[PDB]
């Protein structure tokens, strides 16, 4: 993966040597070129995963996540330039540099074959996200949000390092290829119970799990727009990828250890949809929607059936695109009205019709309108959970009803009704915001034509 890392570490001198007015243009251009050359990762074989060297590899699971990361970086680059126009040039270059560094760490995270390398990069993503949130935020509680995010992650994940080093010392290697062939059954004891806990609670705090989700609606509503995109669309999926990689070594203990996390995620997705029904803010609404969808992904990964895995990976890719677009729309409205309250401005369809169309498309894909990949993932998880137990259809259907309710409540309160009277600075939508919306939509709708490329390693 040296043909994708080296262009990233060459993007860093590109933004550090550019002119005063051409940083955004050049960096957007060359990150789009990297996103184009990312398509060579689709060389997948029906039996063997694509292996590069001793340290890097790419099966069919990490390929959509890699394409999503290196496609997402230009989008944060376009959308993070209207609130940094009045910024010092060195600070703008520092912001861009942390974005490139975070993308480099993310692509060195999914691909790394050896597990402790994946852990090193998985914790290396903590520093630039915290710096972006706590430096280029807007509110007072950004410092508290950074503290909550960092400490939830690290307090959940240092036992993961201890358990991983123990696994290295017992099995003899932490390479993932060898662990597919040197795996052993893990018997019934308290020691294996705490090993399972140490291996799983890090990823499910990052995911997040219900009850441990308190870091998410703080770190999303005080971050900038690019930080919110990279939090919602990629950084939540490190937990899912880690779960998919690490449940290999946790057999046959998961069939009676994963019950309380399943109950937590089911009642948590119900409760977080209910929260979205009574939220006074747009950003917090999208944050709790993310918590609900990630609870769905947790259930799918925990029950570990092939249909659940297909639905899980489709769900992560589709949710990443949808949540990123919703955050972009909310930030455009926040730039227009300079306030975060959903009920403040109303009836924007009469003033901004094309942005209302983009709002409609995002809200429709969020409530899993077929044949989009959102309902593809949701549908596969629904069949898998019905195979697991029948009362899951009751729980899943209640979740779907409340999901449609809050998506259309958000659409009606933001776009429909009588327009507000005393707010008179609603400028027409720029070509930049519309281009960003179209760049979020068009891959998401086009992936319904050929959805076989995001259906996991066991397609």
């Amino acid at each position: 993966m040296l043909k994708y890392i080296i262009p990233t570490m060459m993007l860093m001198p590109l933004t550090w040597l550019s002119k005063n007015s051409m940083i955004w243009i050049n960096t957007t251009l060359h990150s789009l070129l990297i996103s184009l050359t990312s398509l060579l990762l689709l060389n997948q074989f029906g039996d063997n995963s694509l292996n590069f060297s001793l340290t890097f590899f790419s099966d069919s699971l990490s390929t959509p996540l890699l394409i999503l990361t290196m496609w997402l970086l230009p989008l944060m680059l376009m959308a993070s330039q209207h609130h940094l126009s009045k910024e010092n040039l060195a600070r703008k270059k520092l912001f861009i540099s942390m974005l490139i560094l975070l993308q480099l760490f993310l692509i060195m995270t999914f691909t790394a074959t050896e597990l402790i390398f994946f852990y090193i990069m998985f914790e290396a993503t903590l520093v630039p996200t915290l710096i972006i949130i706590t430096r280029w935020g807007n509110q007072t509680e950004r410092l508290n949000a950074g503290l909550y995010f960092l400490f939830y992650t690290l307090a959940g994940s240092l036992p993961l390092l201890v358990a991983l080093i123990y696994i290295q010392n017992t099995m003899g290697s932490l390479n993932f290829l060898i662990l597919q062939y040197w795996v052993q059954p893990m018997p019934n004891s308290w020691s294996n119970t705490f090993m399972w806990l140490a291996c799983m609670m890090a990823f499910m705090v990052k995911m997040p799990l219900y009850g441990l989700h308190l870091w998410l609606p703080k770190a999303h509503v005080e971050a900038p727009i690019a930080g919110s995109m990279v939090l919602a669309a990629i950084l939540l999926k490190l937990g899912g990828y880690g779960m998919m990689r690490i449940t290999l070594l946790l057999n046959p203990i998961t069939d009676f250890m994963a019950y309380p996390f399943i109950m937590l995620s089911l009642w948590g997705m119900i409760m977080t949809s209910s929260i979205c029904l009574r939220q006074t803010d747009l950003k917090s609404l999208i944050a709790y929607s993310s918590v609900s969808h990630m609870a769905l992904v947790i259930v799918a990964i925990l029950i570990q059936t092939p249909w659940s895995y297909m639905g899980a990976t489709a769900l992560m890719i589709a949710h990443g695109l949808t949540s990123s677009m919703l955050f972009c729309l909310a930030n455009s409205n926040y730039e227009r009205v300079h306030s975060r309250t959903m009920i403040l401005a109303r009836g924007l369809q009469t003033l901004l019709p094309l942005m209302a169309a983009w709002w409609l498309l995002a809200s429709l894909t969020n409530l899993a309108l077929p044949p989009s990949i959102n309902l593809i993932g949701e549908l596969f998880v629904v069949m898998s959970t019905f195979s697991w137990s029948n009362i899951t259809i009751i729980l899943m259907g209640l979740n779907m009803v409340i999901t449609a309710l809050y998506s259309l409540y958000m659409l009606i309160t933001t776009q429909r009704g009588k327009h507000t009277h005393h707010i008179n600075n609603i400028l027409p939508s720029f070509t930049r915001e519309n281009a960003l919306m179209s760049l979020h939509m068009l891959p998401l709708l086009l992936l319904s034509l050929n959805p076989k490329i995001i259906l996991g390693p066991l397609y």
């Binding site: 001793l54 790394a112 050896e114 402790i116 390398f117 290295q168 932490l174």
Partner: protein
């Protein structure tokens, strides 16, 4: 006919010829423990480098 020794003569160190055998073990020492084996052989390069976590060299 006895002549006294001069100065420094009675402190001289002499040689004595006697018939007793030399005691082989005056200290009654037990058998000494076996020493550790000595490191030998040419120094080959390290097998697959460092062999520390993920480092290939």
């Amino acid at each position: 006919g006895w002549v006294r020794p001069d100065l420094g003569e009675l402190s001289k160190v002499t040689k004595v010829k006697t018939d007793r055998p030399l005691p082989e073990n005056p200290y009654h020492s037990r058998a000494r423990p076996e020493p550790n084996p000595e490191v030998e052989g040419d120094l080959k390069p390290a097998r697959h480098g460092s062999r520390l976590f993920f480092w290939t060299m």
